Design a protein around this ligand. Structure first.
Ligand code: HEM
Length: 392
């Protein structure tokens, strides 16, 4: 069995093996850094099957030593459940995390992007689009929506890596930091139960309390994943997307000249950015299933290599090319099926507002160093820059 990951992720380079596997052996047995051996799945079509077909279970991972890249299984809350418990949380969350609520955030989101650019200009070039834009932009937006005080970021930001770290933290540190975040949210919940605000933690507590829909621990773990997705995943995708744009200047000039391309541009960035470093969370087969010629037996695990699916030449013409005009884009960057991203409307709003604001306010935006000089954050389940120095 091949040792997986084959190679540590470098910048946004995709490992050439995936294209070889997609063409010659789309499903391959691997050993994982932790837990049971698994079947790596590489193709778009098989990705949809393992993500959405009910013969594949997230909740069954709990009955295994879960195939994974993290030292401990992650507390993935709703993303670790099947029906019926998944339906229960999906419904509570959908009911409070509505499209209307998100769209009504637009003036505040736009204002926050303007305020961050104001500070960049006041402080003078070069600016860091990571710590000086993407991080505080995503942070203030999710903190506002969830109800986690952004002023507490100095306390909680240090615990988030525990939910994502592969090689760089010990079990003992992951457990400790996981406890710290869970316990921080639980304290917040006591305040929000007694003193509701216009935020998701308050709405969730109210819905759960008035229907006894969820246990306190379920509410804690669910709010925690929402904080992580809003804070870490959004800022990672955003900074990575800025790198793609700077490293494909011709597409950047096009976007600046044709701002009506933004919605398709954000979708192409979702596809093209290999955001997930390797795979998302493993599923287990409840019965035998054949995938691209390989028999996956009942009780065996599958690793969904979503970024490789988004480079599937059989689904996207010139899948190795970044083209923000791309019309056919059934990308899986927001997942697919039962666990597909509930945050996608919010993430698309943020991506669009952030990119449009920077290009409208900073027409001459360009990366201030060569790509070779950039420092990436290694040992995590998503890729991100640590700094993106820019000029304007
Ligand atoms: C660019 C930013 C984001 C990306 C790329 C992203 C991507 C994804 C992907 C690929 C999945 C499915 C994972 C799998 O099936 O293994 C997912 C699920 C999910 N995402 Fe996101 N996400 C983003 C932002 C957000 C935000 C802002 C929120 C909420 C504040 C959020 C909440 C969730 C939840 C709750 C799920 C699980 C849904 C379920 O199990 O039913 N995400 N996301």
């Amino acid at each position: 069995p091949l040792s997986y990951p084959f190679n540590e992720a470098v910048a946004l380079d995709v490992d050439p093996l995936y294209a070889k596997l997609r063409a010659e052996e789309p499903v391959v047995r691997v050993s994982c850094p932790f837990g049971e051996d698994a079947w790596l799945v590489t193709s778009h079509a098989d990705m949809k099957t393992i993500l959405a077909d009910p013969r594949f279970s997230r909740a069954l991972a709990a009955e295994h030593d879960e195939s994974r890249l993290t030292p401990l299984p992650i507390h993935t809350s709703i993303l670790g459940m099947d029906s019926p418990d998944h339906t229960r949380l999906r419904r509570l969350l959908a009911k409070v995390f509505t499209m209307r609520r998100v769209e009504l955030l637009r003036p505040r989101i736009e204002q926050e992007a303007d305020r961050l650019i104001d500070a960049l200009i006041a402080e003078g070039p070069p600016g860091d689009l990571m710590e000086g834009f993407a991080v505080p932009f995503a942070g203030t937006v999710v903190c506002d929506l969830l109800g986690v005080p952004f002023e507490d970021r100095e306390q909680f930001r240090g615990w988030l890596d525990a939910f994502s770290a592969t090689t760089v933290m010990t079990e003992e540190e992951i457990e400790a930091d996981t406890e710290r975040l869970h316990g921080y949210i639980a304290q917040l919940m006591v305040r929000r139960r007694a003193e509701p605000q216009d935020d998701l933690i308050s709405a969730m507590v109210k819905a759960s309390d008035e229907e006894e829909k969820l246990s306190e621990k379920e509410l804690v773990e669910l709010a925690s994943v929402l904080l992580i997705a809003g804070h870490e995943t959004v800022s990672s995708q955003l900074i990575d997307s800025l790198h793609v744009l700077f490293t494909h200047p011709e597409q950047l000039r096009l976007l600046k000249d044709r701002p009506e391309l933004m919605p398709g541009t954000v979708e192409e960035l979702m596809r093209f950015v290999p955001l997930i470093s390797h795979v998302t969370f493993a599923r287990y087969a409840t019965e035998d299933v054949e995938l691209s010629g390989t028999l996956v037996r009942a009780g065996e695990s599958v690793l969904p290599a979503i970024p490789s699916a988004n480079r599937d030449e059989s689904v996207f013409e010139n899948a190795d090319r970044f083209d923000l005009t791309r019309e056919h884009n059934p990308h899986l960057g927001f997942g697919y099926g039962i666990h597909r991203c509930l945050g996608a409307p919010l993430a698309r709003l943020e991506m669009q507002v952030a990119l449009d604001s920077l290009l409208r306010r900073l027409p001459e935006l360009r990366c201030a160093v060569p790509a070779e000089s950039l420092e990436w954050k290694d040992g995590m389940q998503v890729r991100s820059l640590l700094e993106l120095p820019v000029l304007w």
